[PDB]
Structure 1
Amino acid sequence: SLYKYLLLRSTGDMRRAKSPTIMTRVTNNVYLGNYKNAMNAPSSEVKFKYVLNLTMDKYTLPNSNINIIHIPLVDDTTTDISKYFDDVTAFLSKCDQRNEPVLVHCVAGVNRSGAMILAYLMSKNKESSPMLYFLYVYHSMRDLRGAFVENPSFKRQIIEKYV
């Protein structure tokens, strides 16, 4: 019934894209969100230690002792993001090992952040066929969030790295 789900999703049964709303917890400590979720991170009962800001501009969070890490990524179809995969997944892995919650976000929480989260989940897959796991993670996250890594260059780079 998961095979049926993936096969229908993969042969023309995708929904129209919608903007994500609430944050999505993806692992014990790692969360995916948009700019509003980042602005709300200092007041979240999750107790974030880090925020990974993938937008083009640095910002600060006044009351907060959160450590904001800035990695500006370009959401277009020519620019490389693969040079960041290993450093980003190693940092996210460390947060999960240390139980230090981290929010990964861009502006809409679809492409730049979605791609780093997809890379992390691929990097943690030890038991499944990478092709199957990619389809499962892709379709399941898109259905949960409304839109997820719509950028086809980003999907291509993740496939080249992990599949």
Structure 2
Amino acid sequence: SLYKYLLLRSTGDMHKAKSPTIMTRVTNNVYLGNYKNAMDAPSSEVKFKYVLNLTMDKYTLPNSNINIIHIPLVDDTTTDISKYFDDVTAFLSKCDQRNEPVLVHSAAGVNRSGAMILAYLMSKNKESLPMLYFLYVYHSMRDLRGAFVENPSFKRQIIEKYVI
């Protein structure tokens, strides 16, 4: 079933992109979100230890004890994001090992953040053929979120690192 699903999605059976609104729990401790979700982090049902801010602006949450890690990226078709895949995925893996909730976010919660979450999931996959796992994670996340790594340059970088 999941296989027929992947092949139909892969041949144009996708919905038009829609903006995510709510935070998504991706793993036990790793969450994916947009800017509003980051602003709402301190009051979230989840007790975040970390927020990974992938936007260009270095904001603060001065009334919170959250540690905000800033990795400034631009959502464009020219930026290398792959230079940070190894260190970001190692950091997210450590958050999961230590049960330290972390919110990975960008402005829209689609491209810079979606790409780091896709990299994390690919990095954690030791079981499945990378090509199949990539299609599965891509489409299942997109169906859940509404839009997920729409930026084709970011998708290309994920494919180069984890599939090719």
TM-score band w.r.t. shorter chain: over 0.9
Distance in 1 between residues matched to 2:84 and 2:147, nearest whole Å: 22
Q: What do residues 60-89 of structure 1 show as CA deviations (whole Å, max 9, x unaligned)?
A: 012100000000111111111111000000
TM-score by length of 1: 0.99
Matched position secondary structure for 2:31:
strand
Distance in 1 between residues matched to 2:130 and 2:102, nearest whole Å: 25
Q: What do residues 13-62 of structure 1 show as CA deviations (whole Å, max 9, x unaligned)?
A: 01000000100000000000000000000001210000000001000012
Displaced runs of 4 or more, over 2 A: none
The aligned runs of 1:39-118 (5 Å cut-off) are 39-118=39-118
CA-CA distance at 1:116 after TM superposition: 0.2
Matched position secondary structure for 1:69:
strand
Distance in 1 between residues matched to 2:73 and 2:150, nearest whole Å: 15
Distance in 1 between residues matched to 2:68 and 2:156, nearest whole Å: 28
Distance in 1 between residues matched to 2:79 and 2:28, nearest whole Å: 31
Distance in 1 between residues matched to 2:101 and 2:128, nearest whole Å: 26
Distance in 2 between residues matched to 1:74 and 1:82, nearest whole Å: 13
Distance in 2 between residues matched to 1:71 and 1:158, nearest whole Å: 18
% identity of equivalent residues: 96
Show structure 1 runs of 5+ residues with no match. none
Distance in 2 between residues matched to 1:79 and 1:59, nearest whole Å: 21
Q: What do residues 124-152 of structure 1 show as CA deviations (whole Å, max 9, x unaligned)?
A: 00100000000000000000000000000
CA RMSD across the alignment? 0.5
How many residues are treated as equivalent by the alignment? Answer: 163
CA-CA distance at 1:160 after TM superposition: 0.5
Distance in 1 between residues matched to 2:131 and 2:62, nearest whole Å: 43
Distance in 2 between residues matched to 1:134 and 1:18, nearest whole Å: 21
